[PDB]
Amino acid sequence: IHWPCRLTIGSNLSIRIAAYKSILQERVKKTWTVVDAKTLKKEDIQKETVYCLNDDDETEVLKEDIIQGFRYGSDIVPFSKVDEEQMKYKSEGKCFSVLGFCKSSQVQRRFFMGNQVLKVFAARDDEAAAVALSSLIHALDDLDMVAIVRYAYDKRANPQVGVAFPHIKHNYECLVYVQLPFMEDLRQYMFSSLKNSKKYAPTEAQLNAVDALIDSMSLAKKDEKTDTLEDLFPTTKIPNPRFQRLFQCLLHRALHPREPLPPIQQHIWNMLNPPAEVTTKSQIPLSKIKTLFPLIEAKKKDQVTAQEIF
Amino acid sequence: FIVCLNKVTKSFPPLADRFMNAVFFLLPKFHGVLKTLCLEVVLCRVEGMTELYFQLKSKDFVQVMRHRDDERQKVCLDIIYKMMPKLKPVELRELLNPVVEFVSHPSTTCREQMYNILMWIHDNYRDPESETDNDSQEIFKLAKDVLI
Amino acid sequence: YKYSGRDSLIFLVDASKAMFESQSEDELTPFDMSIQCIQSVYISKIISSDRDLLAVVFYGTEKDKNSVNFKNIYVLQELDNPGAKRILELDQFKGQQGQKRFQDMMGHGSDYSLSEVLWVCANLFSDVQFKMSHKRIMLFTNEDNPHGNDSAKASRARTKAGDLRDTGIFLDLMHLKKPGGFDISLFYRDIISVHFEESSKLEDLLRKVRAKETRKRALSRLKLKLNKDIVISVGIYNLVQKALKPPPIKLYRETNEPVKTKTRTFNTSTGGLLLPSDTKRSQIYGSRQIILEKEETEELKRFDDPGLMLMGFKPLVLLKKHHYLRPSLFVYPEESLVIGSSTLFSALLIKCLEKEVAALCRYTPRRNIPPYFVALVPQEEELDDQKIQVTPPGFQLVFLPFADDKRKMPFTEKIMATPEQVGKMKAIVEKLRFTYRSDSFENPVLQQHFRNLEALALDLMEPEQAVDLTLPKVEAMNKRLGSLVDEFKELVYPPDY
Amino acid sequence: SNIFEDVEFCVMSGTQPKPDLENRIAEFGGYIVQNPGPDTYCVIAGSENIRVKNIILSNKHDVVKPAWLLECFKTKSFVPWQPRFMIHMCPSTKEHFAREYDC
Amino acid sequence: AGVRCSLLRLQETLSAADRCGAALAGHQLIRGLGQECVLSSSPAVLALQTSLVFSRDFGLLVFVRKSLNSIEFRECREEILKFLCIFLEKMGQKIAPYSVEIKNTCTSVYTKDRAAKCKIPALDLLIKLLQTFRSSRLMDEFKIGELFSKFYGELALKKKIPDTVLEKVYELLGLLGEVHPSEMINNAENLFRAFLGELKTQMTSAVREPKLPVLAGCLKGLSSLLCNFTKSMEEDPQTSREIFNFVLKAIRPQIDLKRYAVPSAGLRLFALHASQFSTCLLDNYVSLFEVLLKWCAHTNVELKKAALSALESFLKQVSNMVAKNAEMHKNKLQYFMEQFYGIIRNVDSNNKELSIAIRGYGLFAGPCKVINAKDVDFMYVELIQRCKQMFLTQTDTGDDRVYQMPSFLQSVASVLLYLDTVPEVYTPVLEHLVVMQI
DNA sequence: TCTAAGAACTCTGATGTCAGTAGATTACACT
DNA sequence: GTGTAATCTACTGACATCAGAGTTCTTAGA
């Protein structure tokens, strides 16, 4: 969606900014409609819900006797819905306003807390705005800082704080926005460290072994002397196998009437597996691994094959 | 931990003292067979600890005693027995109020221990040195009644 | 520590005539200070760790109630999960009229004996049934010598306190306030785990923080397999989660009871009741309808046995930050499943960090789930500030995106800037720096929701109406930057808006 | 008292003993409702709570003095509402008072 | 009798303050009550106990029905319903005046409480109560139809219902048909569809681990259900086929099942209702018979008890089956009469396995007479000399009679049951053996 | 002269998870 | 058979999470 927004910095430097979504975990378009057997009509089923008090199974009237509560320790506050809209934290609106600027390493790769990654571009046909944004972008780039902007899709949406990363491509410079955590969201854990490995002790035989490994299985290696490594596993251009399986299933279930489902088409598996050459390179290094570590046992589970014939 | 301690003390009283604070603190937590073992550890050394009556009412020893579990009851009445000479009367009254309950109980061994308790009460409180302690008089009366 | 275990904090205030009415000046009051502390920490714990345990018990009082019927100790509310019906009780005492009520209900402050007081608190922690993770006792007194008079009481005190130290209980007092008499080497250097008249440690116990926490809970343990034969035991842990508000519960008008939703599915043609077997899933493509078994509608996803599938390794420049998909997770071996695997994990970690390259893998978090491609970017530990864990050592999980995600952008042309305005924008961007710490900000929504919750819970006169750093401080930007907005207007802006 | 039956209340506050407010109502049999829906007659509160501030911010209810119901208990007969007996009113009562009161 | 004082105190425990503390006192008080009044032996004092336990102004049932709002008494409810379960056995059928109230208590508890720990026993008590009060007219006043309504509804609450409570739910839906078929007349087919379908899902799985205990409950409920409302020779290729192939699936331990409820219950299903499946038995005869014998010797005593009954029914149904038609020759003269014959004639197998083997030699006396009369007398002979060498062992104490001549007499009965003539020359021997058994 | 379709976000409800607890089941075992 | 172990499998609290459903906004629009 062409979302335009006013990139706000200060109280007097508004810029029309066009927001665009870059990466979103795609969800299949239309849900599996629930249908009754042996009649195959959608309209024959009602997922009706009923609310019943615990005493003697008294049924309570559907949508005007229930008022939502919350747990606050032992007891339940009778909150409501009307009180909800009366006390909910308001907001002005889009309010994509820059809180400040900070160093690259001041934010870290790990901490990104987003649902989705926006791309933050200029509202079209206002050139001076575009160059203004471009100035912004280069300046952040060479000075190697990032921006932290209050974000909000709109009213009735929770506000949002995160990094504004600035990006460059020979066709165009780019600026992208990601959720970064609020404090309540961050978690903290001890995680007893490892360089106290008085119980694990990675001996040099193991050390140089793993060296040989991670070199040997190098999924990427430089090509064309341009340092464009052998990234013949981009994973970026690779279709989501989930959707592949889903459309395949729908197919075989259409082209045939009732027949049992097929296995995964071997080209999908070939697709997901690494290009063979890595597997070819892999046997000897792993081979030396198997004699250089302890590998005490583990467990396993079952299926319908637990009692399925053949 | 309780099991280990019990097995230790079962032939060695002295070691208990060093851990008996924990023995008590852990008491009300457990339920079931381990309770028996815990109170047994308590028994092994009950003859020495001072201010045991307070510490013992801390955990609901009175309510602990009422439970239908023969071994738990046997160890509880034995606890009563040993701490008998040391406890002041004003509270031996409250402590015998549930001991007297065990007249109706069926575990023959349990009743034998009851009558031992009440024997001792009767022997050592007959005609107290002072009549003012209405507590003492009442204890004597109740003991006599149940023993009859 | 044992997860089901819980953190328990008992509260214990000096109820003598000592500080009930010290009020040297007319700005605070030590009892009104301690009660404020207790109310504050308790409401903080309500939201924070609603599962924990608290208890409040005063000592030296004239009335009496405790488990053991001792003298001058009063257990205000026993150890129980926090709840409103208790904040109410504490609040009943906050105030000059409140302190009149406190004194005329339980006592002005009689004689006491901290030996016995600690006895009381000990019995309290004992009485609870659930398991206790940490056990902590907070005195709120100031008589920095509990008693210089009867030393025997003092010997008994040191003895029992050592015991409590040995029974697994810690103890801590914050020296509240005393004219002079603001020392801990007088009788407490051997109790708690230089000195002044007010405690910093009690300041933060008013900071009034209200997030929530969960312990070291493994999100899922799966076996990273290098190949079809080598496997290691990894615990997929989580390090950022986007706490949504606690899910509301449905209640009846007339009685505030739970209402036990009872959704069901049933027939329209007849008043029948479709049992779960008697349903079918469906789609509509190509004007033709489709049927699958409800079992099949999830069988259509079985792709790999659960775990991690490391394939190769990849130069960290190539794992572009430009394509985040979901919050990252963390990787750290769990010695429990495949014994010794922690070694190999460490080996991979050390070597990869040394040779500055990623590790790509297939992630099947649970059964029935399609796999995604995630990279095991290693992470070095950092401790420098105070030698406390900051970034835990191991591998990240940067999920790599799939082709169905790129969302082809509506191409537009570029217009470079002139070095003049970018040279000034250098100054602009320099001026508005600020160091960004991780926990800088808060959700206004979550925070305000929690607030309004306490508001409705405690029958307050007002909501707290928190002010939250999310909104920018406008005047600050107007000032610290100067009027450069008109500079960039005259540089790169014509009349039109 | 067989009068307050078929009349449904809301004792939203009251701490005069609040839990005894509805008890006194109970031997009079007044229908006791914890949270006022569109059905209820009026709402009774011995002070202001934030929910009171809500139901003020949504005029869909009639909000009453503490003393009024006590008087109706001391009339042994329901006393239909009067200007002092209220501390806020609903729009139906306001349009009724646009007939029934000087402004 | 201290039952009265103890009970009196129990209802006191309801109103004490520290409810989370009053709970423990109450719980082991009620345990004491149970221990006291299950031991009782005097047929007088026993009545006093009973009428105090099910008392009204107080008593265990009122304690439940009134301590049911609180959650602090989960353990107490659990023990009180367990003690009802034991009592119901201890005074079978005497509780007759209180059955209706017990049923109302059971259904009340099942509706109210949350934690399974109280639901499991709750359903258990209904199971016991129904199973013991079958005959009496009391059955009509449990309003069993309403019970079927309520629990059938329970079967559809988004399947949140936990596992073991679900297995007992299926148990009761089953045994409900058995106790009072008349009220189920218009509801049975629905329930069959339910059990069949849910069994299918739960055992013809694709991804989910088999909720074993759920399955055990399912098929045992099916067993109880087939007692009436038969399902053979009517819609067999659908209905009976599904039931049957599920039974096969249950029997087959396609992996070594460390737990035994599923096979045990399956064997019982087959045992008590092979009469339905008689048609399809011959389809899989080889597999069935193999699996059963192999199954006849695992250590679990209950399982062995299931297995023997299963084999007995299998052989019996097969024997009945052949007695009608002449194509299954390539069945007996290819598999049975040789495999069990080879058992007897070679093995050093178990005593029990030998007994079932001799049985098998017998039960096929029918087909023997259908196919060739001249073999009937021959097998009669062979059996009676087996007898003659198994009784005249010259006082072999403690080993030989132990499990055998019961079997042989069973067998000789079987064979004579179809002998045309009488080998009178051998006859006196037979009654000599009969006396020996006596 | 304006009415749907997608969008998007949030919210709710199940599914599956993990640690813990403890029960009942099943193996072991008695000369 | 009888009785005591060992130990698997359960349930629950609790926490993530897909999906599913309720809701506002742009274009194409009588």
PDB file of N, CA, C and O in Angstrom, chain A residues 127-162:
ATOM      1  N   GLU A 127      10.130  16.599  -5.978  1.00  0.00           N
ATOM      2  CA  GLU A 127      11.552  16.309  -6.095  1.00  0.00           C
ATOM      3  C   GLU A 127      12.318  16.842  -4.899  1.00  0.00           C
ATOM      4  O   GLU A 127      13.029  16.087  -4.224  1.00  0.00           O
ATOM      5  N   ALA A 128      12.131  18.123  -4.581  1.00  0.00           N
ATOM      6  CA  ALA A 128      12.896  18.728  -3.499  1.00  0.00           C
ATOM      7  C   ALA A 128      12.794  17.889  -2.240  1.00  0.00           C
ATOM      8  O   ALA A 128      13.782  17.704  -1.522  1.00  0.00           O
ATOM      9  N   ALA A 129      11.615  17.332  -1.978  1.00  0.00           N
ATOM     10  CA  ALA A 129      11.505  16.401  -0.870  1.00  0.00           C
ATOM     11  C   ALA A 129      12.430  15.221  -1.080  1.00  0.00           C
ATOM     12  O   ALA A 129      13.107  14.775  -0.144  1.00  0.00           O
ATOM     13  N   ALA A 130      12.476  14.698  -2.298  1.00  0.00           N
ATOM     14  CA  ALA A 130      13.282  13.508  -2.506  1.00  0.00           C
ATOM     15  C   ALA A 130      14.743  13.811  -2.247  1.00  0.00           C
ATOM     16  O   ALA A 130      15.439  13.049  -1.567  1.00  0.00           O
ATOM     17  N   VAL A 131      15.219  14.947  -2.740  1.00  0.00           N
ATOM     18  CA  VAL A 131      16.619  15.261  -2.522  1.00  0.00           C
ATOM     19  C   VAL A 131      16.861  15.515  -1.048  1.00  0.00           C
ATOM     20  O   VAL A 131      17.931  15.204  -0.524  1.00  0.00           O
ATOM     21  N   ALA A 132      15.876  16.077  -0.352  1.00  0.00           N
ATOM     22  CA  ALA A 132      16.048  16.305   1.072  1.00  0.00           C
ATOM     23  C   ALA A 132      16.244  14.992   1.789  1.00  0.00           C
ATOM     24  O   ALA A 132      17.161  14.835   2.609  1.00  0.00           O
ATOM     25  N   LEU A 133      15.422  14.022   1.453  1.00  0.00           N
ATOM     26  CA  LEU A 133      15.582  12.715   2.055  1.00  0.00           C
ATOM     27  C   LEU A 133      16.935  12.137   1.692  1.00  0.00           C
ATOM     28  O   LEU A 133      17.598  11.515   2.527  1.00  0.00           O
ATOM     29  N   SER A 134      17.368  12.362   0.454  1.00  0.00           N
ATOM     30  CA  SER A 134      18.637  11.814  -0.001  1.00  0.00           C
ATOM     31  C   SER A 134      19.790  12.394   0.789  1.00  0.00           C
ATOM     32  O   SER A 134      20.746  11.690   1.133  1.00  0.00           O
ATOM     33  N   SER A 135      19.735  13.692   1.039  1.00  0.00           N
ATOM     34  CA  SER A 135      20.716  14.315   1.908  1.00  0.00           C
ATOM     35  C   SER A 135      20.719  13.620   3.251  1.00  0.00           C
ATOM     36  O   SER A 135      21.776  13.228   3.765  1.00  0.00           O
ATOM     37  N   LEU A 136      19.528  13.447   3.819  1.00  0.00           N
ATOM     38  CA  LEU A 136      19.422  12.749   5.084  1.00  0.00           C
ATOM     39  C   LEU A 136      20.168  11.439   5.008  1.00  0.00           C
ATOM     40  O   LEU A 136      20.992  11.105   5.869  1.00  0.00           O
ATOM     41  N   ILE A 137      19.913  10.704   3.940  1.00  0.00           N
ATOM     42  CA  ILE A 137      20.385   9.336   3.860  1.00  0.00           C
ATOM     43  C   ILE A 137      21.898   9.307   3.769  1.00  0.00           C
ATOM     44  O   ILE A 137      22.562   8.647   4.572  1.00  0.00           O
ATOM     45  N   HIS A 138      22.467  10.034   2.819  1.00  0.00           N
ATOM     46  CA  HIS A 138      23.920  10.012   2.719  1.00  0.00           C
ATOM     47  C   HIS A 138      24.545  10.432   4.027  1.00  0.00           C
ATOM     48  O   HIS A 138      25.494   9.799   4.505  1.00  0.00           O
ATOM     49  N   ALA A 139      24.008  11.487   4.633  1.00  0.00           N
ATOM     50  CA  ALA A 139      24.627  12.011   5.837  1.00  0.00           C
ATOM     51  C   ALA A 139      24.654  10.947   6.912  1.00  0.00           C
ATOM     52  O   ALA A 139      25.679  10.731   7.567  1.00  0.00           O
ATOM     53  N   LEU A 140      23.545  10.237   7.078  1.00  0.00           N
ATOM     54  CA  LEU A 140      23.567   9.147   8.034  1.00  0.00           C
ATOM     55  C   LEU A 140      24.594   8.110   7.620  1.00  0.00           C
ATOM     56  O   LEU A 140      25.299   7.549   8.463  1.00  0.00           O
ATOM     57  N   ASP A 141      24.728   7.888   6.315  1.00  0.00           N
ATOM     58  CA  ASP A 141      25.524   6.768   5.832  1.00  0.00           C
ATOM     59  C   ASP A 141      26.996   6.982   6.116  1.00  0.00           C
ATOM     60  O   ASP A 141      27.623   6.194   6.834  1.00  0.00           O
ATOM     61  N   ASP A 142      27.567   8.046   5.556  1.00  0.00           N
ATOM     62  CA  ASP A 142      29.002   8.260   5.688  1.00  0.00           C
ATOM     63  C   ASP A 142      29.390   8.468   7.142  1.00  0.00           C
ATOM     64  O   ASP A 142      30.423   7.963   7.592  1.00  0.00           O
ATOM     65  N   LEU A 143      28.562   9.178   7.901  1.00  0.00           N
ATOM     66  CA  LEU A 143      28.783   9.363   9.322  1.00  0.00           C
ATOM     67  C   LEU A 143      28.380   8.151  10.127  1.00  0.00           C
ATOM     68  O   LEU A 143      28.590   8.130  11.343  1.00  0.00           O
ATOM     69  N   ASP A 144      27.794   7.153   9.476  1.00  0.00           N
ATOM     70  CA  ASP A 144      27.626   5.818  10.031  1.00  0.00           C
ATOM     71  C   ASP A 144      26.848   5.974  11.334  1.00  0.00           C
ATOM     72  O   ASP A 144      27.328   5.645  12.421  1.00  0.00           O
ATOM     73  N   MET A 145      25.689   6.583  11.236  1.00  0.00           N
ATOM     74  CA  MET A 145      24.760   6.633  12.341  1.00  0.00           C
ATOM     75  C   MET A 145      23.424   6.109  11.853  1.00  0.00           C
ATOM     76  O   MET A 145      23.223   5.908  10.655  1.00  0.00           O
ATOM     77  N   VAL A 146      22.505   5.898  12.774  1.00  0.00           N
ATOM     78  CA  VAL A 146      21.157   5.484  12.416  1.00  0.00           C
ATOM     79  C   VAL A 146      20.175   6.380  13.137  1.00  0.00           C
ATOM     80  O   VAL A 146      20.561   7.170  14.000  1.00  0.00           O
ATOM     81  N   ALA A 147      18.909   6.265  12.782  1.00  0.00           N
ATOM     82  CA  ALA A 147      17.886   7.124  13.340  1.00  0.00           C
ATOM     83  C   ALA A 147      16.832   6.296  14.047  1.00  0.00           C
ATOM     84  O   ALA A 147      16.531   5.173  13.648  1.00  0.00           O
ATOM     85  N   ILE A 148      16.261   6.868  15.094  1.00  0.00           N
ATOM     86  CA  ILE A 148      15.276   6.192  15.918  1.00  0.00           C
ATOM     87  C   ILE A 148      14.024   7.034  15.905  1.00  0.00           C
ATOM     88  O   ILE A 148      14.028   8.159  16.409  1.00  0.00           O
ATOM     89  N   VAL A 149      12.948   6.496  15.361  1.00  0.00           N
ATOM     90  CA  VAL A 149      11.776   7.299  15.065  1.00  0.00           C
ATOM     91  C   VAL A 149      10.565   6.668  15.715  1.00  0.00           C
ATOM     92  O   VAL A 149      10.352   5.459  15.595  1.00  0.00           O
ATOM     93  N   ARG A 150       9.778   7.475  16.404  1.00  0.00           N
ATOM     94  CA  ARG A 150       8.463   7.015  16.804  1.00  0.00           C
ATOM     95  C   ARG A 150       7.674   6.715  15.554  1.00  0.00           C
ATOM     96  O   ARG A 150       7.646   7.519  14.623  1.00  0.00           O
ATOM     97  N   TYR A 151       7.040   5.560  15.522  1.00  0.00           N
ATOM     98  CA  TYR A 151       6.292   5.130  14.358  1.00  0.00           C
ATOM     99  C   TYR A 151       4.880   4.801  14.775  1.00  0.00           C
ATOM    100  O   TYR A 151       4.633   4.382  15.905  1.00  0.00           O
ATOM    101  N   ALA A 152       3.962   4.972  13.845  1.00  0.00           N
ATOM    102  CA  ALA A 152       2.607   4.534  14.100  1.00  0.00           C
ATOM    103  C   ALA A 152       1.907   4.434  12.769  1.00  0.00           C
ATOM    104  O   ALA A 152       1.928   5.388  11.992  1.00  0.00           O
ATOM    105  N   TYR A 153       1.299   3.284  12.508  1.00  0.00           N
ATOM    106  CA  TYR A 153       0.535   3.156  11.285  1.00  0.00           C
ATOM    107  C   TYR A 153      -0.578   4.169  11.236  1.00  0.00           C
ATOM    108  O   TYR A 153      -0.810   4.781  10.190  1.00  0.00           O
ATOM    109  N   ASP A 154      -1.268   4.361  12.350  1.00  0.00           N
ATOM    110  CA  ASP A 154      -2.387   5.280  12.419  1.00  0.00           C
ATOM    111  C   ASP A 154      -2.942   5.334  13.823  1.00  0.00           C
ATOM    112  O   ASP A 154      -2.357   4.767  14.745  1.00  0.00           O
ATOM    113  N   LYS A 155      -4.070   6.005  13.985  1.00  0.00           N
ATOM    114  CA  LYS A 155      -4.839   5.897  15.207  1.00  0.00           C
ATOM    115  C   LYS A 155      -5.177   4.433  15.468  1.00  0.00           C
ATOM    116  O   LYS A 155      -4.890   3.554  14.669  1.00  0.00           O
ATOM    117  N   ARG A 156      -5.764   4.172  16.631  1.00  0.00           N
ATOM    118  CA  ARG A 156      -6.208   2.844  17.044  1.00  0.00           C
ATOM    119  C   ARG A 156      -5.149   1.768  16.844  1.00  0.00           C
ATOM    120  O   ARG A 156      -5.467   0.578  16.864  1.00  0.00           O
ATOM    121  N   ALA A 157      -3.896   2.158  16.666  1.00  0.00           N
ATOM    122  CA  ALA A 157      -2.793   1.213  16.597  1.00  0.00           C
ATOM    123  C   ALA A 157      -1.762   1.556  17.657  1.00  0.00           C
ATOM    124  O   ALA A 157      -1.532   2.726  17.960  1.00  0.00           O
ATOM    125  N   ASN A 158      -1.160   0.532  18.230  1.00  0.00           N
ATOM    126  CA  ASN A 158      -0.151   0.763  19.241  1.00  0.00           C
ATOM    127  C   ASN A 158       1.027   1.495  18.623  1.00  0.00           C
ATOM    128  O   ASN A 158       1.441   1.171  17.510  1.00  0.00           O
ATOM    129  N   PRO A 159       1.580   2.454  19.293  1.00  0.00           N
ATOM    130  CA  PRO A 159       2.715   3.177  18.743  1.00  0.00           C
ATOM    131  C   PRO A 159       3.921   2.298  18.724  1.00  0.00           C
ATOM    132  O   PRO A 159       3.816   1.116  19.037  1.00  0.00           O
ATOM    133  N   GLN A 160       5.072   2.837  18.394  1.00  0.00           N
ATOM    134  CA  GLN A 160       6.115   1.923  18.006  1.00  0.00           C
ATOM    135  C   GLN A 160       7.441   2.645  17.895  1.00  0.00           C
ATOM    136  O   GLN A 160       7.494   3.736  17.327  1.00  0.00           O
ATOM    137  N   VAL A 161       8.512   2.076  18.424  1.00  0.00           N
ATOM    138  CA  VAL A 161       9.817   2.715  18.374  1.00  0.00           C
ATOM    139  C   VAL A 161      10.843   1.756  17.800  1.00  0.00           C
ATOM    140  O   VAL A 161      10.880   0.585  18.186  1.00  0.00           O
ATOM    141  N   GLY A 162      11.675   2.238  16.887  1.00  0.00           N
ATOM    142  CA  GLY A 162      12.717   1.383  16.347  1.00  0.00           C
ATOM    143  C   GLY A 162      13.630   2.120  15.389  1.00  0.00           C
ATOM    144  O   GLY A 162      13.455   3.305  15.110  1.00  0.00           O
TER     145      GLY A 162
END
